[PDB]
Amino acid sequence: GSRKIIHVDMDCFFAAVEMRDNPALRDIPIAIGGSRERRGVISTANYPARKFGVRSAMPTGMALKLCPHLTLLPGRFDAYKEASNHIREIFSRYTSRIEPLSLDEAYLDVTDSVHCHGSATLIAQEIRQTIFNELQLTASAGVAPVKFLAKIASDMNKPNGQFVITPAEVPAFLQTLPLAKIPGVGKVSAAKLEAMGLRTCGDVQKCDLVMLLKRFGKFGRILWERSQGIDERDVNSERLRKSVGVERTMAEDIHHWSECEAIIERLYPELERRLAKVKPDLLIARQGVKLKFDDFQQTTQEHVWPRLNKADLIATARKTWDERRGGRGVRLVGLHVTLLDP
């Protein structure tokens, strides 16, 4: 009763696309991200930039101090979306059991596959080879009996490689696996887990489920399970978008409602155009706004509302501006919509 799960993951995705489309970028350090003047961050970087320590989510000013010749690119999201659609279609040639997790990656359940003599290892390799043909981009892959181990595995032999974890290999792999590598255990949780002496799955295996449940709730059950290789989550090909949002951080903080209003007027057409692609009649479940202050606290306020409406967003932003700004400056303004249920 053992499933075969593939996780496919594109290498340096946004950067790989820019280098394909402009070979002059192949061997110099490059990164997609907002300039330091726009208070931006790195979305991702190629391997020459990563050599300098440039990483995703690094403030761009830090990236540039580490790597002064970093070439900064704004991003071509239709180019990325197009490569995303193309790899998903490549995935469909092998199975319909496809759960995309972002533009550049997906789980595949190939348990019931007839391709490559039922070998999940060869399926993954054929998929990666096919993606290199056809798109001139490379991908890595992970093969395992459950989702999270497959997703961990695709990072281990990257770029342009794969890694297989058999059931026989699961207990050795788990024993020294850092908790922070489990998707969904982030910096905050890893630091709480570290501070009680829990660093690895082998550490958590020596723990009581009842204690984990008291101290972490449902998360403690996930921790307990994952540390044993337990991950019964099914590959689900039927997930749907639940929200759409548009926000911008300005180059300088704002302090006047007129400035905030001016920003919303430019945000709103963009929110409308994006909603309309998925919901032509603009019918929605909720809409709302987001401010982030110069002390980096953030507030959202949103409400039931039947259809995208600019004036109500302005009104709501006005209340938020007056009712919970407390005189600090504002670095981000955002608009947001919750989609209807079906």
Next chain:
DNA sequence: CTAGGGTCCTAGGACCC
């Protein structure tokens, strides 16, 4: 020196039974 696109979980009061 701290983005923008999102998902999921938690938690209190409202409301309904």
Next chain:
DNA sequence: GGGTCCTAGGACCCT
């Protein structure tokens, strides 16, 4: 007091 909706906030995911 138990479901469920409403709303806010936050950890976390991807590049």
